[PDB]
Amino acid sequence: IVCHTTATSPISAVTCPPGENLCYRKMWCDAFCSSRGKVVELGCAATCPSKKPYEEVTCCSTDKCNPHPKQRPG
């Protein structure tokens, strides 16, 4: 899983020994809904279900794909 790997990497294209067949972008709050930050956990993942803890998850396969920030259309 060579994407935005934070498994001992600063958002770096590393094939993570911790995790499974998905690339993360596990993002939520967004002011960390208090005193300003963007909680993006970059977790090498098995599946992104429909019935999830409702966060904006760009659950990609591999090859960079899914970066930290708000994946917002220009």
Partner: peptide, 6 residues
């Protein structure tokens, strides 16, 4: 073993 970035 994964990190939060802000």
């Amino acid at each position: 073993k994964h990190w939060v970035y802000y």
